[model samples]
Target: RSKVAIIGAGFVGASAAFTMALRQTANELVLIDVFAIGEAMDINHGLPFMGQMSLYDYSDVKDCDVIVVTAGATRLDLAKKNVMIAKEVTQNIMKYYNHGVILVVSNPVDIITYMIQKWSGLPVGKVIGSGTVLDSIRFRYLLSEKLGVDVKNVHGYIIGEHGDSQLPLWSCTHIAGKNINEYDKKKIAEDVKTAGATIIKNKGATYYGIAVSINTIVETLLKNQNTIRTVGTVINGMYGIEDVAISLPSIVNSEGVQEVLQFNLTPEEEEALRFSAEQVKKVLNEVKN
Candidate 1:
């Protein structure tokens, strides 16, 4: 039985718990938000009745198999605000629970992911950011629609930073056994980059996609599935970069990130990955001040 504790009960956290329940991955779900008592309870009250499992609040997340940190602002502009929150949240989480794979879903995620790993003193593999996993999913979706192919049949990746600096591997993308060329690549790239803003402008918030994405991560970890996802993890001398976390292809398993798979990116893509690292590092300096 997998015990998954989510550290926030906002739209993203609650939706993650709800979806986790529906997906039947979490035998024990814990909702731990200091300010959102009702939000956590509401999720428990309805859903537990029909499911094989239920939500809890012991929040002794230390006993959990997985701890997901969804606390912090969702906007890229709130870098400082969310970074401070992440610092405090990591402190508290480490105090009671020094075990469990911690999945981060906060904005400025790459930087926050790096920070949490440093602050928590967890193994590098244990702290992961739900980075371009969703962005790449969006890329595949849009690409499939354009090519009239099933989203599953579209193979590609959106790597690097999760924000404006994120890059789609057009050189590596494939659909129906054909290279992902012969199409307007720039348009889809722009579409994936701006997808978050469009949703925020329309609905004032975005959660469904991220909620589902995080669940996918949690499921993979719990099942010990060696699934490769472009998640935010520390760069250890990879691609002439180090001491930062960015979204790249990583194998996720019971221990969290089993390994970061190596990919041969084009020369320009390598430059872009370095640029993504610089952007995250720059934001971190600003957050520190």
Candidate 2:
């Protein structure tokens, strides 16, 4: 009987509820938000169609096994401004923090995740970020199109920062069970790089894909599936990069992020990842202290 609480009821939070409810991912789901309950009002009406997972109001999450924060500024240009909100919201969350793994889904997620862990007095692994999991899914989706296979058949990751500096794991990408060494690597990767920006240009917000990403993460945790995911965690010198929370191949389970696997990277890719770390670290410094 796992219980999960979402700390925001915005687009991402609302859509995440729909996905998790549809999948019956948790025994109970809780919604907490600062804004009025417009989305919750509608979603509650449709609970009949959703499933067995119950939705609760913004209650103190002392009993929740997992608490996911999805609060952030709606604008992309104000990630720094959002951190101000992150501070206050996190303080409130910490007041009720009993025992649960936190999933940070806020923007500049890597940094926000880092701050929450630091502020909450929790272990590094207890605060995980929904990092490049969104981008990794877009990468696989695009590659599936390029390779003419089901998206489920394509497997890989977009590592490091969840931002522009993130690197696509080309060396690890495979179709079915075989490696994909050739084909339009540059084009597909480029497409994934701009996938979110392009979608935002067309639609003001991006939610559905990320909602699924949240569902995958929560389900993985509740099931205690010790599976690998490209989640962001504070990386302390696994690949010569330390002191920054960046997306990497990590094993997640009910205990939280069990470990971050050190995978072999080509010199080019390894150096690119190092550069990505510096990029995130520099920004984290600018906005965080």
Candidate 3:
């Protein structure tokens, strides 16, 4: 029995698994790659310092409590191919899924998460995507730079969709309860928007921070952290949007997203969120069910 079974041995999957290994996050990690079985084995084999860990393929990961799917394409994959890759991975799992939390780590994550939700028929909370959580952290870090404060105290979010449509919820941004707008801003906002692409441009792809972010979710769930993050989860009557798994602040623990925090958004920010929602819905509509 493993605490977490990670599906897909791509860059994201391999990175997350390595992060968990370095941190001793879960007792056991079972890895299953739909298209990269050899790569998965190679990743496991290279971890001589990772100590004892159970590595598996699709056939051996049935007993896990959490099923993390990171089987999507990388920056090198065919252009605009992540969604299909993620769908293929999900299709593979739907045939063999057991009772476990399904963590969606695929890109175009907002759409992929919805697919996972529809295919699994699981509750809104049980199935989640690592939405703008990483972006939120980076946003705070960017704000921290401008405000001359530690990133730990800069609490803010880049919400709505996780892609180009993502919006910084400036109304709710706080430097430990202090409104973020009151702080000076010049390059901060744009940095939060383009950070991922910048990181990817410089370093092949964005990985380490995201690896840590997924690990944070795993620990928060397994240890019952009850902490909040900017994950893509379902909200009921929140700012008008409902029943969609888009990025928003949420509480995560053993039960997954327990509740979404309803924060006030300025008219422009709210519209930005709605526009982002539209973009997400548009992308999701690309492939019909």
Candidate 4:
């Protein structure tokens, strides 16, 4: 029996619950929020029509298979302000945090993900972040459009930080299993990197796409599918980067992130990843010290 808990009933959390309910991602789903229960009941009112078992409450999550935190601010630039919230949330989680994978959706995700793992004393792989998965999805869509291929046929990842410093791994990107050598890499990368801003510019908040992203990852975990995704997890000596949580192609499943895939990177791609890592490290240092 798969059980999942979402901490926070805001737009992202509510949308994620809806998506998961539609997909039947778990046998049981619970939404945790410190806010009003009215909103949660409103979400539950739709579940019967959607088809699933779910509950909304401010409850303990010690037995949950997956615990997702979407309760904090959604900007990496506001790392300083968000860290305190992240710490408070982490402490709250610890009250009943016996054992389960923590999927952080809060902003400054890399930093929060890192702090969660450190504070909870969980294994690096067990605490994952909704990192550049959305960015990578955008990259695939743009690359597929440009190559005139179905989006499903395109494969790539936007690695490093999930924020302004993120980088697309163009060296390994492919369309229909063929190397993407002719497309305008920079244009597509920029489009993927800035896609969130574009959405936020038009809509006051971006939820559906990210909610779907969260659903996809959670499904992968619940199904124990060893799917490779660009999720944020602790880095250790990959491209000489360590002690920071950043996005990389990792195999995820019920056991959490099983392995980090080190695909071949061109010299330039390696340099870009290093630069992105350095940017994340700077903010992490500031938060810790």
TM-score of each: 0.92, 0.92, 0.87, 0.93
Best by TM-score: 4
Tell me the whole-model lDDT of each prediction, alpha carbons only: 0.82, 0.82, 0.75, 0.82
Candidate 1 residue lDDT tens string, 37-62: 57656666665434335554333776
Per residue, candidate 4 scores C-alpha lDDT tens digits across 1-289 of 7788898888988899888877778888888885535655776676563335787643468678899988776344578777777777777887777657889988778888888788778889899999998888888888788777888889888898998888888778877778876633578878776778888898977889889989988888887768889999999898888788999999988777889999888888788888888888888888873
The per-prediction CA RMSD against the true structure, in angstroms, equals 2.2, 2.3, 3.1, 2.1
- Given candidate 4, what's the lDDT at residue 272? 82
Report how far residue 70 has shifted in candidate 2, in Å.
0.9
Q: Which of the two, 2 or 4, has more TM-score?
A: 4
Candidate 2, residues 1-289, lDDT tens digits: the string is: 7888898888898999878877878887888786626665676666663334545444467777788888987344466777777887878887777878899988888788877777777899888999988788778888887677888888899899988899999888878888986534688777777877888899977988889999999998988867788999988877799888899988887668888888899999999999999987887787764
Error of 3 at 48 (Å): 7.9
lDDT value, residue 255 of candidate 4: 70
TM-score of predicted structure 2: 0.92
RMSD in angstroms between candidate 2 and the native structure over all alpha carbons: 2.3
| Ranking of models by TM-score | 4, 1, 2, 3
Candidate 4 matches the true fold with a TM-score of 0.93
